[PDB]
Structure formats: C-alpha cells, structure tokens
UniProtKB/Swiss-Prot annotation:
UniProt xrefs under CDD domains: TLP-P
Annotated InterPro entries: Osmotin/thaumatin-like_sf (IPR037176), Thaumatin (IPR001938), Thaumatin_CS (IPR017949)
Main location: cytoplasm
Protein name: Thaumatin I
Compartments where located: Cytoplasmic vesicle
Function description: Taste-modifying protein; intensely sweet-tasting. It is 100000 times sweeter than sucrose on a molar basis.
Organism: Thaumatococcus daniellii (Katemfe)
Family, per entry: Belongs to the thaumatin family.
Gene Ontology annotations for the cellular component aspect, listed alphabetically: cytoplasmic vesicle
Keywords for this protein: Cytoplasmic vesicle, Disulfide bond, Signal, Taste-modifying protein
Cysteines joined through disulfide linkages: C9-C204, C56-C66, C71-C77, C121-C193, C126-C177, C134-C145, C149-C158, C159-C164
Length: 207
C-alpha cells in the first residue's frame, strides 16, 4: 500500500513511519514546506504509525535529535517517536479490511489529515490549533502539547489497569479534535476501509 506523505506546513518537518519494532519503508525523511514523499507499506502491517517531527538536526550518518517525535535520534525511524506526536495509525489487511485513525493519546505536535486516496471510506482529521490552545500544564517546553499520561504518569491518565474514564485533559483534546482518540478508552473514531486501500497523510491540511 502506498501512503503519500505531504507537508503543507510552512515549516520543515521530518516525516516518520514505523510499526514499533521496525521502520516502514525508509522509516523517515525530511519534508520541506510543500514536499511529498510516497512510501510503500507491506500489506498486513499491523499497528503502523506515521507522524511528523519538528526542529531536527541530523549529521551526515543520519543521527541527531528532534524536539518532537524523536525516535532514538535517527533520521530513519525504526521505533515510535518521543511525545508529543499527533499520530496517523493503521492496521492493513486485517481479515479483509484496513483500519485507520488519528490519535492524540501521545499528545499533539502538528495538525494532520489522514485520508484514503482510493474508494470506499472517509478520512479523518485533527487540524485544530491544539498547540496554541494547549492547557498550561500540558505545554511541552520542547514544543507541542503533551498528553496527560506523559506529564503525570498516573493509572487514570495512562489507563494502566484498563479501567480509566475521560478527564479534564482528555476532554480538551476531544473538544479541539472530536475525530481523534483523546484517551485510551475513548469511544472509537476508527474508520474501516477496504483491504489494500492507499492513503495520503497531510501535515497542516488547512491554512
């Protein structure tokens, strides 16, 4: 499956793509404002994620650091990124279907649209100004808006015991972005698409 990753932001981002234990495709690449980078993700990929990273420096070997989304200092990500990270999430060819969603469970750094380029389902979007409206205690000094698990490390925010409910903090993400996961046990906003769909992830989809 092809995922076209498009940076509409006015600033450079370094796209990242991983299933947690491995890169997807090259795993990471710089995208200047306006650039598009198409990756190929193997069918059957379960638990894939694509995200943006901001204010990165890499040296000539592809080692460095990003202020949001850093995945162990590599350009070419093999693991998930350091919060805060808006997440495009997908499992492909799961008993005949694809599942996609955007999640704010690991915080928000960059607005995002995650849409199929092929027929038979709809896209999802979290494009509100979550960084600018971020509650004081969630603001990440490094840039972006942290989820409350990252900040406070409690069973309630992290949903450790599997029994959490919504919180003042989760409710802020859900109010700004109703169509993205705001906490682990949020009512799902997962979209079912035909198996083997193709996709576009757009950073900063709206002015």
């Amino acid at each position: 499956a092809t995922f076209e990753i498009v940076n509409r932001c006015s600033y450079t981002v370094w796209a990242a793509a991983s299933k947690g234990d491995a890169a997807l495709d090259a795993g990471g690449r710089q995208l200047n404002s306006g650039e598009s980078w198409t990756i190929n993700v193997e069918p059957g990929t379960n638990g894939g994620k694509i995200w943006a990273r901001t204010d990165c420096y890499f040296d000539d070997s592809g080692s460095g650091i990003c202020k949001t989304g850093d995945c162990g200092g590599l350009l070419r990500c093999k693991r998930f990124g350091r919060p805060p990270t808006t997440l495009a999430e997908f499992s492909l060819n799961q008993y005949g279907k694809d599942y996609i969603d955007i999640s704010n469970i690991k915080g928000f750094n960059v607005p995002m649209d995650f849409s199929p380029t092929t027929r038979g389902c709809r896209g999802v979007r979290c494009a509100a100004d979550i960084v600018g409206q971020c509650p004081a205690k969630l603001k990440a000094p490094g840039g972006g808006c942290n989820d409350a698990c990252t900040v406070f490390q409690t069973s309630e925010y992290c949903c450790t015991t599997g029994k959490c409910g919504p919180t003042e903090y989760s409710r802020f993400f859900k109010r700004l972005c109703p169509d993205a996961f705001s906490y682990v046990l949020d009512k799902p906003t997962t979209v079912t698409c035909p198996g083997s769909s193709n996709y576009r992830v757009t950073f900063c989809p709206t002015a």
